[PDB]
């Protein structure tokens, strides 16, 4: 069977319960080239998750659903068995392998739950081809109505808040924020955008390039200097990787800071997220549940010397590369979803109306 990925380096004592891997170490060096235990599509998907070729939560969910459609297409029911259970039992090891390649996101968890419910509801007296076609159609409908139409509705809703001659501060890279800003600029709103970035990913350059190509006037700076630009900032628009049942917003590592600093400068905070990213779990800190990225990514060249080059030699030295933080509900003013403009405390309510 598939082995277990080896932990890399030494972890922080407070994060010792989380797995920490390295990008150089690949899990496919111990698996047969014509993969049998793991479907080849899942192998490719895990390879490009571990190497970082798919980063955004929406992109990760779409890639997972595409590979999963391929797996369903290639799937053939074994003799003397039922599809509604065999399919789930076969899919579980693929999900375990994907988690080993890189910890799953909230969108991927919700998509997996949705497909498990869809497969479980497949009748036992229907043809295999019909069941496969229905599963593919359900995946397509899920993708459409949970990403495309949701983004369109969120852009339409956010067009109202964006006014002429105001300043909007965005953080990191998210497709929803970029689409909102581009559509608002297209409809005739005139405004500036301030892009805040953070090491080591430096993914704010993606949205910077998108805004420049769209014609929107843009400014760029790192996150420590955020307190310098908030005096002239009118709104802080953020994207969320997940909304928790207690209202807390799980997002990129710097996001919470911005909200806090925004509260210090009396600047409204808007968070745009799709309702399928709403999670019924709750957490109050970035310690109980998080993901440790490759520590070697923290190395930077300042001049001709790299200070953290051989950081393994120092026994008492540790490096952590967090990828998520949790924002308390009291630092967030708006949540913009396809349902509408809701307070940060209405997250469970939506979770109640989307389950029945």
């Amino acid at each position: 069977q598939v082995p277990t990925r080896k932990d890399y380096g030494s972890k922080v004592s407070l994060f010792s319960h989380l797995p920490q891997y390295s990008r150089q170490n690949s899990l496919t060096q111990f698996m047969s080239i014509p993969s049998s235990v793991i479907h080849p599509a899942m192998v490719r998907l895990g390879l490009q998750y571990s190497q970082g070729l798919v980063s955004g939560s929406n992109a990760r969910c779409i890639a997972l659903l595409r590979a999963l459609q391929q797996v369903i297409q290639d799937y053939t029911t074994p003799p003397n068995e039922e599809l509604s259970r065999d399919l789930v039992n076969k899919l579980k090891p693929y999900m375990s392998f994907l988690t080993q390649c890189r910890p799953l996101s909230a969108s991927m968890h919700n998509a997996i739950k949705f497909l498990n419910k869809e497969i479980t509801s497949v009748g036992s007296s229907k043809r295999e081809e019909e069941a496969k076609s229905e599963l593919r159609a359900a995946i397509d409908r899920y993708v459409q109505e949970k990403i495309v139409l949701a983004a369109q509705a969120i852009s339409r809703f956010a067009y109202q808040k964006i006014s002429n001659g105001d300043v909007i501060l965005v953080y990191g890279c998210s497709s929803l924020v970029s689409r909102i800003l581009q559509e608002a600029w297209t409809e005739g709103r005139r405004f500036r955008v301030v892009v805040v970035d953070s090491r080591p990913w430096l993914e704010g350059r993606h949205t910077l390039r998108s805004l420049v190509h769209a014609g929107v006037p843009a400014s760029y700076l790192l996150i420590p200097a955020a307190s310098y630009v908030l005096p002239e900032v009118s709104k802080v628009l953020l994207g969320a990787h997940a909304l928790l049942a207690n209202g807390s917003v799980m997002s990129r590592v710097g996001t919470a800071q911005l909200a806090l600093v925004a509260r210090a400068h009396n600047v409204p905070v808007l968070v745009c997220c799709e309702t399928y990213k709403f999670c019924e779990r709750v957490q109050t800190d970035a310690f109980v549940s998080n993901e440790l990225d490759d520590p070697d990514d923290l190395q930077c060249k300042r001049g001709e010397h790299v200070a953290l080059a051989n950081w393994q030699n120092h026994a008492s030295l540790r490096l952590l590369n967090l990828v998520y933080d949790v924002t308390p509900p009291e630092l967030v003013d708006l949540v913009i979803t396809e349902l509408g403009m809701i307070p940060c405390s209405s997250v469970p309510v939506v979770l109640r109306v989307k389950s029945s």
Binding site: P34, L47, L53
Partner: protein
């Protein structure tokens, strides 16, 4: 199946063990329950009988014509190909971890993944990361100067060139490459005029060509000196293998 292994013989049973055995063992180590082999017919269309005396899990053998190239062999065996192919040759004595080339194929959804080793005439040029190759040509086609398109340097402003590298003739090829070969009978040899065409077709939904550079072993070429070097190296190589 993800891959279909194809072995070329257009062949040598010489050595401590048959020269064709080593590629077969390399394929056998990493999965590959079955493998298709094209057997020589110019010298003797009976090497299938000789291979029937070997020890392998499963082999399918197909006799070839008198004279035919690698592309011609693929054209002959088209009906038996169903997915992406992994083309090898009898002359390949390597200890490379095959997961590198196939991992390059898997990760980037490449149309071609190939393996080469540092030498110990043909110019190749890869980008900064050293994985994707941007240029490839031979001294026969170039009169005195090497010409690079402006678009290539516009997209990739840093091309690093190798000259002495040795092609190992191990290719992971996508299925539509085979289909394009089938629609066009002009191409006769994979190395000579198939791979360069794909390389130049990148810059003209886009073709992706990737290469992996090794530093341990090459294949036993047709020269007798190459055979002697392979025989010398296989004594230490065959210990673990």
């Amino acid at each position: 199946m993800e891959f279909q292994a194809v072995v070329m013989a257009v062949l040598l049973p010489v050595g401590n063990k048959p020269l064709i055995w080593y590629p077969l063992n390399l394929l056998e180590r990493v999965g590959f329950e079955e493998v298709i082999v094209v057997t020589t017919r110019d010298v003797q269309k009976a090497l299938c009988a000789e291979f029937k005396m070997k020890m392998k899990p499963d082999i399918v053998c197909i006799p070839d014509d008198a004279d035919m190239g690698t592309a011609d062999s693929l054209r002959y065996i088209y009906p038996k190909l169903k997915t992406d192919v992994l083309v090898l040759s009898c002359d390949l004595i390597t200890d490379v971890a095959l997961h590198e080339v196939v991992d390059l194929f898997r990760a980037y959804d490449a149309s071609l993944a190939m393996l080469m080793r540092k030498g110990q005439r043909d110019f190749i040029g890869v980008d900064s990361t050293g994985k994707r190759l941007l240029f490839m040509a031979n001294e026969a086609d170039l009169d005195e100067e090497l010409v690079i398109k402006g678009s290539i340097l516009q997209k990739h402003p840093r091309i690093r060139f190798h000259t002495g590298l040795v092609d190992a003739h191990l290719y992971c090829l996508k299925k539509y490459i085979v289909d394009f070969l089938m629609e066009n009978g002009s191409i006769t040899s994979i190395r000579s005029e198939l791979i360069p065409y794909l390389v130049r077709k990148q810059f003209s939904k886009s073709l992706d060509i990737y290469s992996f550079i090794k530093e341990a072993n090459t294949l036993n070429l047709a020269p007798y000196d190459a055979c002697w070097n392979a025989c010398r190296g296989d004594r230490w190589e065959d210990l673990s293998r």
